[PDB]
């Protein structure tokens, strides 16, 4: 339909339109009954209690998508070319992009082959030149995402401050990324946003943490997501070694936003900072949530 478009950008850069307007132009269409495609799989936890079981929390699980495509052409040689190109568009080690475009925008999922594809019918595929490939792909990162929102604040003063507007319009908490120039001592916000995960929801409402004093040439990236180390210098200096066990603890909870403050001190040149706010969603399409 014209309300939904599904595309695949392979690991080699090839572009396919499985469903939607212009689907099947490259020879591959999407068969029905695709699973674990819409909602992010989450399992909830329960402890024994006096009234049965008590809620203990939730964990989001990786997506195990199983879907069939149909590769077709008029002649078997061109069908063989199409099938080979489709196979080349996938890999186990590196992930290809799967984009869904609706009136809510375009959200992409990074997927890799979980196991070998299951191609063709019972007979040889050159008889038909129109054969299905069943594919079991997996999303290690299970959330659908959009292009992150980026803001830049530069200054020439030795000491300065700024406000970054931030707002999570998605379904799930997002983890902020910072890029900070050197030299200079930065103070970055780590607001709880009312999140009570550490039982400090309103104690950490205005939490600010000071990064270690960066030496010349030691521009740092401070990624708060748990997949990656928090502090990483671009010159290879061990910055987090000088941070005494400090860390950024809180994601940007959904529906929360404010003018988070960034402070720069002891910057003789006057540095710059960049804030990246990811746009993660648990669904290929969803109306914005206030």
């Amino acid at each position: 339909t014209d309300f939904l478009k599904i595309e695949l950008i392979g690991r080699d850069g090839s572009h396919w339109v499985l469903s939607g307007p212009g689907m099947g132009q490259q020879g591959v269409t999407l068969n029905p009954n695709l699973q674990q495609f819409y909602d992010a799989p989450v399992k909830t936890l329960y402890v024994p209690g006096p009234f049965g079981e008590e809620y203990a929390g939730k964990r989001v699980q990786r997506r195990e998508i199983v879907f069939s495509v149909q590769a077709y052409d008029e002649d078997p040689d061109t069908w063989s070319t199409v099938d080979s190109l489709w196979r080349w568009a996938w890999d186990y080690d590196e992930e290809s992009e799967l984009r869904v475009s609706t009136s809510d925008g375009t959200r992409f999922l990074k997927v890799r082959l979980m196991e070998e594809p299951k191609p063709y019918y019972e007979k040889d595929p050159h008889i038909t030149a129109d054969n299905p490939i069943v594919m079991t792909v997996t999303a290690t990162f299970p959330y659908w995402q959009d292009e992150p929102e980026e803001l830049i604040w530069t200054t020439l003063s030795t000491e300065d401050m700024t406000r970054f507007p931030v707002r999570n319009d998605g379904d799930v908490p997002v983890w902020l990324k910072w890029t900070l120039t050197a030299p200079g001592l930065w103070i970055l916000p780590d607001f709880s946003w009312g999140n009570d995960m550490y039982s400090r929801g309103r104690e950490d409402l205005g939490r600010t943490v000071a990064m270690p004093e960066l030496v010349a040439g030691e521009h740092v990236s401070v990624d708060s997501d748990p997949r990656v180390q928090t502090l990483i210098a671009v010159n290879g200096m061990p910055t987090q070694n000088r941070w005494k066990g400090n860390d950024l603890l809180y994601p940007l909870m959904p529906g929360k936003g404010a003018e988070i403050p960034v402070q720069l001190k002891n910057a003789p040149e006057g540095g710059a900072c960049k804030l990246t706010r990811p746009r993660w969603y648990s669904r290929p399409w969803s109306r914005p949530g206030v």
């Binding site: 699973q35 195990e64 199983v66 079991t136």
Partner: protein, 42 residues
């Protein structure tokens, strides 16, 4: 297809084919690895 058959039996874990002999032997091997170096030679 996968959800609701052997592919979810795999998620269940050791409900179907799984023997006790090698599990016990592996537990014994792990304990032997832990305790053998500290056992006296006497």
């Amino acid at each position: 297809s996968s959800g609701g058959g052997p592919a979810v039996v795999n998620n269940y874990g050791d409900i179907h084919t799984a023997n006790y002999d090698e599990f016990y032997k592996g537990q014994q091997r792990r304990e032997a690895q832990q305790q053998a170096p500290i056992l006296p030679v006497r």
